[PDB]
Amino acid sequence: QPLDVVVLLDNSNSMNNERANNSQRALKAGEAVEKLIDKITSNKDNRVALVTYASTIFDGTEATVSKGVADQNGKALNDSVSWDYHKTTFTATTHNYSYLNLTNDANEVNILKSRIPKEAEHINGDRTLYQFGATFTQKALMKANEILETQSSNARKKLIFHVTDGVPTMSYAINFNPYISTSYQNQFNSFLNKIPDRSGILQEDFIINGDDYQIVKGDGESFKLFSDRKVPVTGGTTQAAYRVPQNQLSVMSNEGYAINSGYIYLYWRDYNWVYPFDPKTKKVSATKQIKTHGEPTTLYFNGNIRPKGYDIFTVGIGVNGDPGATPLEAEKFMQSISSKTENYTNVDDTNKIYDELNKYFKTIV
Ligand SMILES: [Mg+2]
């Protein structure tokens, strides 16, 4: 049986070659993927596809991300020193680092290989694209799944190789209904009940039908969703605040900001809150609560990908759960998105990445 292989490649900001003590994660990950691609395609029967991801799919199309904090009414502002306060979404053309069609055409394969990234965005480089450097694992897995489901067949052996250095910091929302009396726990159980083994949630019960920036949970801040909606002062315990300069007071007042004696007190934007919550009164669920991006990603995986029988291998790079997951949560998570528990390996050395990919390829061929 010929092989149809999707490589999923993390190009998050944390992969930038200067990070983790100059260990060159993007370079080494990129070359490992390149070598894997050559090894797979030396059999003419085998096809390959490439999905590079961070906050979105890097496929050369335009994407939008939401950022910033908010006042007590959820009115968004960017408190960064590098951006005007109105700059609460970014819209940019992504790098073309993906090849979304399974191919065994030699010319096409070389095009795929030429799109493999060897670097990630730098905080002092392209600061707009840097906004797109978070970790939206579910979207990437959805894309790899979409390629195989639409382009492969029941007659072909299907593999995913996933190279990542971080737990998800964004997720698609589970579609809880706030306007019925059924508890959020009962609604969640009804979602599970649609899968034979009760272990996951079908794509149809996620909010998918709209632009990511409007509908996704998380903005790269954390693996966790926050129960305390107040932004703390870094190095205090008290709630952070944005001090309105004198010449911006009337404008910010007219814009509608909640200004209290010259200060706007700072809250996480509501895509970063524990959910579900009542959309009008803001009251959080008193039963089922989603508190991490790992949970919905794993529920998505079990409901929609895991039944399909693929071999899915995951190579982590210095994975420790940052930001917001414990090392144990991160490990279980990465295994939960691999087709077997032993199909996840976490390296502490970027020079071992290819060898772990090869090891996994060797169990197949
Ligand atoms: Mg990362």
Task: Check which CATH number belongs to the domain holding 351 and give it.
Answer: 3.40.50.410
Q: Are residues 74 and 167 in the same domain?
A: no
Q: Are residues 219 and 243 in the same domain?
A: no
DSSP state of 326: -
Ligand 1 center from residue 279 Cα (angstroms)? 31
Residue 84: what residue type?
A: D
The percent helix, strand, coil of the chain (3-state, each to 5) is 35, 20, 45
Quick count: other Cβ atoms within 10 Å of Cβ 91? 11
Q: What region does 271 belong to: left with phi over 0, alpha with psi -120 to 50, or beta?
A: alpha
Residue pair 257/186 in contact by the 8 Å Cβ criterion = no
State which residues have CB under 5 angstroms from ligand 1, the bound ion.
Answer: 12, 14, 165-166
Quick count: other Cβ atoms within 10 Å of Cβ 321? 18
Ligand 1 center from residue 307 Cα (angstroms)? 28
**Which residues, other chains included, contact 283 with Cβ-Cβ below 8 Å and sequence gap of 6+?**
277
Read off the tokens for 297: 């990603």
The residue to which tokens 């390996």 are assigned: 345
Q: Are residues 83 and 178 in the same domain?
A: no
Q: Are residues 148 and 248 in the same domain?
A: no
Ligand 1 center from residue 145 Cα (angstroms)? 21
Q: Are residues 74 and 49 in the same domain?
A: no
Residue pair 275/172 in contact by the 8 Å Cβ criterion = no
Which residues belong to the annotated binding site for Mg(2+)? 10, 12, 14, 135, 165
Ligand 1 center from residue 56 Cα (angstroms)? 13
Residues 192/196/197/200 CA torsion (nearest 10 deg): -40
Ligand 1 center from residue 167 Cα (angstroms)? 8
Indicate the residue among 249, 268, 287 that finishes a domain.
268
Indicate the residue among 239, 268, 297 that finishes a domain.
268
Resolution expressed in Å: 2.0
Indicate the residue among 247, 268, 289 that finishes a domain.
268
Domain that holds residue 169: 1-67+88-229+269-365
Q: Are residues 123 and 250 in the same domain?
A: no
DSSP sequence for 11-67: --GGGSTTHHHH--HHHHHHHHHHHHHHHHHTSTT-EEEEEEESSSB-BSSEEEEE-
Q: Are residues 131 and 240 in the same domain?
A: no
Per the entry, the structure determination technique was: X-ray
Read off the tokens for 310: 């693929």
Read off the tokens for 89: 């979404």
| Helix H or strand E segment including 138 | helix 137-151
Ligand 1 center from residue 164 Cα (angstroms)? 7
Q: How many domains is the chain partitioned into structurally?
A: 2
Q: Are residues 152 and 212 in the same domain?
A: yes
Q: Are residues 213 and 241 in the same domain?
A: no
| Distance (Å, whole) CA 181 – CA 198 | 23
Which residues belong to the annotated binding site? 10, 12, 14, 135, 165
